[PDB]
Design a protein around this ligand. Structure first.
Ligand SMILES: CC(C)=CCC/C(C)=C/CSP(=O)(O)OP(=O)(O)O
Ligand SMILES: CC(C)=CCC/C(C)=C/CSP(=O)(O)OP(=O)(O)O
Lengths: 273, 273
């Protein structure tokens, strides 16, 4: 039934993102549950692409399930779809960012060809900004249009942050998200990258992106007063638990070729309060 | 002196390309020597990028030496520059493809962002077709304009062939030259590639490119009668020693994630005769 389907999504978010599970555990009941179901959609699609053996076939099957879902023709025992069906019935969730997140995950089926910062922002929009857009009707009922730009920019901030701390892990998987034109601009070579070398050129490039992320975090945090009261600490705390990674990397001399404990998360959420 | 400078380039080509050294050892003396010096220019630039510790600094220094060379202001003991200076003084070598090869090697200082076949041909033009263009005044004196298109296409054929047999070695070095749009077209995923998997999608993609290479080889070989007699077996034999790789790969079930012995080279050159 519905309560058990959502409970399955609660376990998914608690297992895969203590950051978001702690942040949004404070939301009122039905909005909290919707967040769980929306997270589960994003987590399933991302896990298919990043950890599936036949990711393209499995993502096509997931996309077809979402097609059936949107036509009201999905018969399933999947708790994530059962919960999401209620969330869409209960709140004016917009299907567009759900479709666009699948487009983003399609991007990650193939090797990267990120040339410019605009290419990078296009990627971040589809795999991260869309998450913000999916959530907005439940985080800010009736106020979506006012907080929308900040939610897109929070997606940019968080995904740029992920990229900046995942350079080595991504490289090991033959994924490169650093824009080629920025490597040319700063003189950071593919051989430097392959050798996992931190040098002056790397630090200049890394700081360029990190300063853009910091700009986007500031813009997003400035919109917190426009959310309803129960979403302000959840959204601001989630933002600040991601942003914390940047100063840690700096304090680690930019060694990102290999960040926030649960107590540290609790501290960040209380500080935000 | 000049004889020793060229002899140093003879040793370079004999050490790094038994294919080209055997092919062009049949050329008349002064044209043979020019080929050695031209090869040495290409080999030095490629070795800087592919095996140098600080490739960008070393390629900038090489480019500055070529700037001085072209102004007649290079004072050097480098036998490769001494030999090339005579080749430029002796034959109407065109500086343009030498500059363009340096542009191509600059491309390989950074990770690849090859999206389309046209992107791939652009790369092959600058790192391979340019070699053909550098050589044409010594392989076909007075007849450069007639054989030029075939020489560009031979560059495409040879470099596509290199890419098709180097997929694994390039992947290990975080280089991907397969066009992303072709991976999408045939359904060959980044995870497949990372896993070094040969599947139906890979074979379709590989054959698509191999058939383009075979087309370019046929066009190039059709121009052999327009070369002077002493270049026909050298150029045709070099072409056929590279082309041989394609059928071997097919006979090896497309296993290119890890080709022509010296006797096999001698056999191909005699067959071409
Ligand atoms: C609360 C609002 C409006 C936005 C916060 C949530 C958001 C943009 C999540 C996307 S971060 P992302 O990188 O896509 O997801 P993970 O890699 O952390 O799993
Ligand atoms: C004889 C003519 C006109 C063209 C033949 C030479 C040519 C196009 C050589 C370039 S092959 P390329 O891949 O650039 O060089 P290597 O990787 O084999 O060292």
């Amino acid at each position: 039934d519905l309560n058990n389907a959502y409970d399955h999504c609660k376990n998914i978010i608690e297992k895969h993102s203590k950051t978001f599970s702690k942040a949004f555990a404070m939301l009122p009941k039905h909005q909290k549950r919707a967040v769980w179901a929306i997270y589960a959609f994003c987590r399933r699609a991302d896990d298919i692409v990043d950890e599936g053996e036949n990711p393209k076939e499995e993502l096509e099957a997931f996309a077809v399930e979402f097609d059936l879902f949107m036509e009201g023709r999905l018969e399933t025992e999947d708790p994530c779809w059962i919960a999401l069906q209620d969330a869409f019935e209960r709140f004016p969730l917009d299907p567009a960012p759900f479709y666009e997140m699948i487009v983003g995950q399609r991007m990650d089926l193939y090797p990267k060809t990120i040339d410019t910062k605009d290419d990078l922002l296009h990627y971040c929009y589809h795999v991260a900004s869309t998450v913000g857009l999916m959530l907005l009707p439940v985080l800010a009922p009736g106020k979506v249009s006012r907080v929308k730009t900040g939610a897109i920019e929070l997606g940019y901030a968080m995904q740029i942050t992920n990229i900046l701390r995942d350079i080595g892990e991504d490289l090991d998987n033959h994924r490169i998200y650093i824009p080629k034109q920025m490597m040319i601009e700063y003189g950071y070579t593919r051989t430097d990258l392959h050798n996992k070398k931190v040098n002056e050129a790397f630090i200049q490039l890394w700081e360029d992106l990190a300063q853009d992320a910091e700009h986007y975090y500031r813009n997003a945090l400035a919109t917190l007063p426009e959310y309803p009261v129960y979403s302000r600490t959840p959204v601001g705390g989630a933002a600040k638990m991601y942003r914390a990674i940047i100063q840690t990397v700096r304090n680690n001399d930019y060694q990102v070729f290999g960040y926030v404990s649960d107590q540290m998360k609790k501290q960040i959420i209380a500080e935000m309060q």
